C-alpha cells in the first residue's frame, strides 16, 4: 500500500541504482530520500523484495 | 507523426502509467512496471515520453 508519489519516488531511485554505474551524487541523493520519511526506506525495502521475486521468475 | 510507440507497446505504456495514477500502489505493481520499463528501449521511452504529455495536457486542463 505505497500512496502513489511515494511510490513513483521509490521508482525513480531504485531504476537509478539499478544502472551498470551509479554516481556518488545520485547515491547520496537516493539515500537522502531514504532516510526523509519512514515510508520512504518502507516503499524501497518491500519494493527490492518484490524486484528480486520478478527476477526469479523470468 | 513526430515519432509514434508501436501500438503494443503503447497499449503497455498506457496499462502502467494508470496504474501509477492510483491513490495506492502495491510494491508488486511497481515491481511489474520498473521489469516492463527494464525490458526494452522502446519501453522506457514511450514511460518518458507520456509522462511528459500527460503533464502537458493537465495543465491544459
Do not use: D, K
Amino acid at each position: 500500500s505505497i500512496p502513489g508519489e511515494v511510490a513513483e519516488q521509490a521508482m525513480h531511485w531504485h531504476l537509478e541504482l539499478q544502472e551498470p554505474a551509479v554516481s556518488a551524487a545520485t547515491l547520496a541523493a537516493c539515500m537522502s530520500w531514504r532516510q526523509a520519511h519512514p515510508l520512504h526506506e518502507h516503499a524501497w525495502q518491500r519494493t527490492q523484495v518484490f524486484a528480486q521475486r520478478l527476477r526469479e521468475m523470468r
